[model samples]
Target: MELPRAFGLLLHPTSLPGPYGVGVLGREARDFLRFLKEAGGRYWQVLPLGPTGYGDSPYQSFSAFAGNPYLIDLRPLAERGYVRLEDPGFPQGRVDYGLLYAWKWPALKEAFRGFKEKASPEEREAFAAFREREAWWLEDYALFMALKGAHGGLPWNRWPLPLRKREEKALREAKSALAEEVAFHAFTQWLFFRQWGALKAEAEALGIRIIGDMPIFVAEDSAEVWAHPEWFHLDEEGRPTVVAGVPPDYFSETGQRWGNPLYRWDVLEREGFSFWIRRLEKALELFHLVRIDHFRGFEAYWEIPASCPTAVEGRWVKAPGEKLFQKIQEVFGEVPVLAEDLGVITPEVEALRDRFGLPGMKVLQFAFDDGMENPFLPHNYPAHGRVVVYTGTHDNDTTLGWYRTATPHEKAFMARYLADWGITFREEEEVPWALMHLGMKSVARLAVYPVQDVLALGSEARMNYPGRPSGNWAWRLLPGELSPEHGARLRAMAEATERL
Candidate 1:
């Protein structure tokens, strides 16, 4: 999967400015696409589009196959005669999740009702076609959402024993009782595909490709895990036996314990890797390229006991990476995957990534922390691979803020490294721009910078903190934040570096 020598901006749709609190697949997104094109950008990368659950993080989604209904455009719904956009006024600045959810859910429910009552024959045929096409995953997801709604949105583990174990009688009765709600969930998915498909088409017309993120772990409470419990290492009561995490690393003193249920790879292999095939197939449908978050997990993963408070008491567990990729390649042809090969990497992990011909990431921020031989440094990159280089990703601090907080030794090392380049970083703002210049000039095929770094925002605009649970993934770009001057400067860099 060869990549073009170009640059892109990483801006999650939720971070885009919109009138309805958080961003949507609406006018604001289209405007941002235009902005990207005018800035000489050739790619637009985003985080997962899945419906977020606890902590309001996209990584921990309710259904891996379902789109976030919160991102649906109400204005377009009104135009299609499915909603009255003026009926409920949502806050314009900050995303009040509670109020926004309260307002949007009912409106979408109304849209579903309208479709049921007034759908034409053609529309009904289209709906049926959509259901048939997505039946493999959609049936289970819709039923799961319907059942969750009936239980007042409780996690599956807390449901009644019969329902929690998905006994046939209980499952059938629940689906019969909540048929309308199941249809509503399915309807929302259809609308999301219709909207997002159009957006992807528009991006393609502009010669822009989308790179999407895929979290290596799924939420314990997700529909995928609940529907196929045998595929995960869960106890009889459906609780995780051993969870996912890293050993003590740079991000935390005690490595962060991400309590996602580990996969039962033996069972997954017995099923001929069907679940993974479906997951990757769905991802390819959504984006031209996909970056598998925590790629090292495929080679070896840290398995922490579910009861542990942190990741300190974890041990490495071997994973079936080679077999999985082999199965994927057999089923889907070449895998267009970008390995997020960061954090505590080993030679074995690098070997696995190279064997699959997947490009690993290189971050400019990480390069300054080490010597010239660092793999993250530009000179150490492999030109033949399909690399996705970044100044900083969602988890890292904004480039400017990261520079200010760097230790004296790191600053001195960076100063000496950049001495021959005739670069001057006198202020915080200069840090991000200089890093961006370095990233664009790197030999890596694809260069991406977080939108916050482009705007030179401080820590306040940081998207997520690796170990922190609260107040993360809340940063939103205000209107007019990306000024014309900012675009011109970025365009100039891209042009000068031949990244345009």
Candidate 2:
């Protein structure tokens, strides 16, 4: 699976400019694909398409297998007489998740009712086949969400004792009692997958391959852990004994304490890594290529005690990377996956990544390190085309913003580096374009720029702040922002670099 030498954008579907307040798998998505084609882009990378939980972050999903209910298109359902537009009005710009969430479900519920009452026989047959095909994960996930609602959105650990433990008798009773609610959840997923498939096909038809990401860890509040406690190191009360986190990295001094449960790799091994296999299998179905977020964790992960407030006390523990990947490759041969090998990677982690020939990541924003030598520097970057370069990622500041706040020494280094390559453009005024040019011209086979950087936007357009959890993942692409002029520039640069 040799990757094409190409460039793409890092934008989540939620950010697509839409009157519905958030992106939907409808007309807007199709237009975005067309825009990519117009811009000579071959890849459309999106973050994990999972149901966001506590924070509105895709990384912390409610279910690994379930699609984000917020992304479903209501217009198609409206046309099918399944949904009614009560208020055609929505907030002007940003997505009001609370407002959007409160609004869509009622409409989706109406749609589900209509689907059951009036769907054609062919549609019903397709739905039935989908339900049967995905029963392994969907049934459990639907039950999980239904029970979450039944208990008023409490985490699974706080649910009734029998249900919390997932006793067969209790599950059977709950499923029967909440059959209608369960069906609604399943119906929504059906719509999501069906819509997503159509959108993906359109992108493929336009020669734009979808690149999706998968976070290595699942939220402790997720359905998978609730369904299989033996797979993770959970206490009697179902709380994580040891959680996942990184020890003092660039993002935080005390380090970021991500409280996802640590997996019992030994238990996972006994199952022949079937869960991991299925995850990659599903990922391949949705995306032509996948990025494994925190891929270094597969070699060794930062394990923090659940009692700890910060990640400072976390220790690196060995993970069964070899066996896990062996199973992965066995199930799906030669997957095109990029490894997120950014944070505190050791030589062994590098060994594991190279062992699989999985291209690692490089961010130009990280390359300017106070005039010090950096791996992200194109000069130091691996000559082989086994890397994916980025001007900035969704988690990183926009290139324009990064340069604005960079140290004078680092700025000088950047200027000199670009000057060496003859990539001069009013430096301060055109930082974003300069970085994208650097990325495209690098030896890396794939170059990706966050859409913000492509637009030369500043901090106001930043997608996420690693240390600050809230007030992130809300940036939207405004209409008319990607005019023909920008498309022409992008195509010209990509063509000049022989990246298209």
> For each candidate, how many residue pairs have backbone atoms clashing (under 3 Å)?
0, 0
Candidate of highest lDDT: 2
Candidate models: Cα lDDT each: 0.85, 0.87
Sliding window of 10 residues with minimal summed lDDT for model 2 = 87-96
Could you tell me every candidate's TM-score relative to the true structure?
0.94, 0.97
- Scored by lDDT, model 2 comes in at 0.87
lDDT per residue, candidate 2, 297-359, as tens digits?
A: 899899999999989988999999988987878778775678988844488988887888888
Residue 9, candidate 2: alpha-carbon lDDT: 82
> Candidate 1, which ten residues in sequence have the lowest lDDT sum?
85-94
Error in Å for residue 481 of model 1? 3.1
Alpha carbon lDDT at 1, candidate 1: 65
Against the true structure, what is every candidate's RMSD?
2.0, 1.6
